[PDB]
Write a protein that binds this ligand. Sequence first.
Ligand SMILES: [Zn+2]
Ligand SMILES: [Zn+2]
Lengths: 50, 257, 64, 115, 148
Amino acid sequence: DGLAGESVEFQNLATLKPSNKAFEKKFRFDYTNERALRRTLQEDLVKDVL
Amino acid sequence: PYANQPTVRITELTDENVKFIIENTDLAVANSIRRVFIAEVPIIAIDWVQIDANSSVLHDEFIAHRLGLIPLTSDDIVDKLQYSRDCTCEEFCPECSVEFTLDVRCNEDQTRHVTSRDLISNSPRVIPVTSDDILIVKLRKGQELRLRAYAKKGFGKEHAKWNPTAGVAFEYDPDNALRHTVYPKPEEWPKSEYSELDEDESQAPYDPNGKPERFYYNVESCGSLRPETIVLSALSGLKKKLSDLQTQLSHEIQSDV
Amino acid sequence: MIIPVRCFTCGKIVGNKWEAYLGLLQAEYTEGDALDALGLKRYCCRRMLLAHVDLIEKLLNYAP
Amino acid sequence: MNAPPAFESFLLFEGEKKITINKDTKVPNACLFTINKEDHTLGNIIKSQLLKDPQVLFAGYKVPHPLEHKIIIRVQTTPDYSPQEAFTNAITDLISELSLLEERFRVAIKDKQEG
Amino acid sequence: AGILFEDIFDVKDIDPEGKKFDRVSRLHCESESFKMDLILDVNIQIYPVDLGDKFRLVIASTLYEDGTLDDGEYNPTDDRPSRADQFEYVMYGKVYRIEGDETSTEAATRLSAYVSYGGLLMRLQGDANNLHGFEVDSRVYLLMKKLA
Ligand SMILES: [Zn+2]
Ligand SMILES: [Zn+2]
């Protein structure tokens, strides 16, 4: 990889383990649901997204 | 002005030890008084041994070491005797040291005990405290020990030979009203000799708004000084150190302005 | 080789108590009572005077 | 070989000063009294006496190394009260304490000896 | 006046899981006015408490009853009349996490406020209408006085 061994850390890949349903649920951005997207984002931002 | 108003009550006073109590005082002040008892009370002890002849089974440094540890009476002369470093003499003089002479030769059949009684001193006020006597060395027939020593003035910070105390028993809060020490099983611990509890109780109830206020002392003298004089010299020495520090602080403040 | 002049721990004088201790032991006193009669209360001094070996007595057997 | 002389624990030879003053720039009205050739004996009492003074906000001491003979006492006081004044007042109060204790001890010794 | 929360609590239980630490005990308490729930770690040597004791929580963001930010420095030489005079157990800490019952769509309806007082932790569950002054990484005071 090209990386010295003194600056690397242990991390967990969040994509390898979850099943297809869970992966799609927790990694696919949704925009049909207006209420949730309005809760997460600001009014201008959700207007732009939709 | 926030100085304390300490009080003293003396419980026991013999020629060997003094047992007293200090009330209404900081823990730090009492602890520093104990440390001054141990290590900052000047006395007179042998510190310059010159050996002319030594046919004993003990080498010269051993004899010098055992001579240095012999306590010498230092009741009143220690105040009038200056430190050798501060004296104007070249090496040693009567105003800053005491001369001792030992001269023993064994020619009888039985073993001879060179004890502290053989330390002859020119100054009558400074003698070994045992005057059974402290054993310096045993001598077989034909062996002689001839030496001359000089005793300086010093305190315990330099060497343990100048320690006047023989164990300063210091105690405070004999029952854990302050919980400064947490007993895992309080019932197992013996009660302190200054405790004020009945048999059923193991330790006093916790006191959330208490501080160390009463300090029990037991200053046992080796013999160089009377115990009362050890305590008086300790307090005077601590006062003198603080006054010297104040003088230096005043000079520094005036120099910084 | 010889009794120390002072207890190592506290500094109590014990160099003058060896001969008295031996004399007490010769008087059919147990070690504990002999130590108690000599004023050694703290167990440091009792250690000092109980565990001592008088090797100078054997060193004095050789001619000078 | 490298054993220091025993007297260096309490003696100042030519070159050093018993006390020095150093303003602390981290916070206002703070001083770092560096005292040479002393130990916990004069550090603890000074800290405890300073702690009683209600105008002293911080008062601590440290020994940077047990083999080096030097203590550092840090004092920070109220804006309306100099740290040097706090140090001087603490020493004066300690001296008064010790004088009173000495006098009372002498009286108690006299009483016990008399009866 | 900076009073983020105000209520009177009943000590329902003390150390349900056991005496975890000698000087600190965990109180499980339940109010009745707002019907909240307060787990709280309190020092016991300096301030004992018994089962079934009423005490008033006046958790506030400032003791100086003026709204002026204290900034969190110890100032024992202060004369102004702070709120720590009518309460016999005052604590200082940080609100380190705020949980809730949020769904993707619906808003919060039952909030939990977690406050760490230098190690002594507290959880305050209740209706979201009461826990609005609580914010993450906000420094707050906890005030307690027992009621006779
Ligand atoms: Zn001289
Ligand atoms: Zn001993």
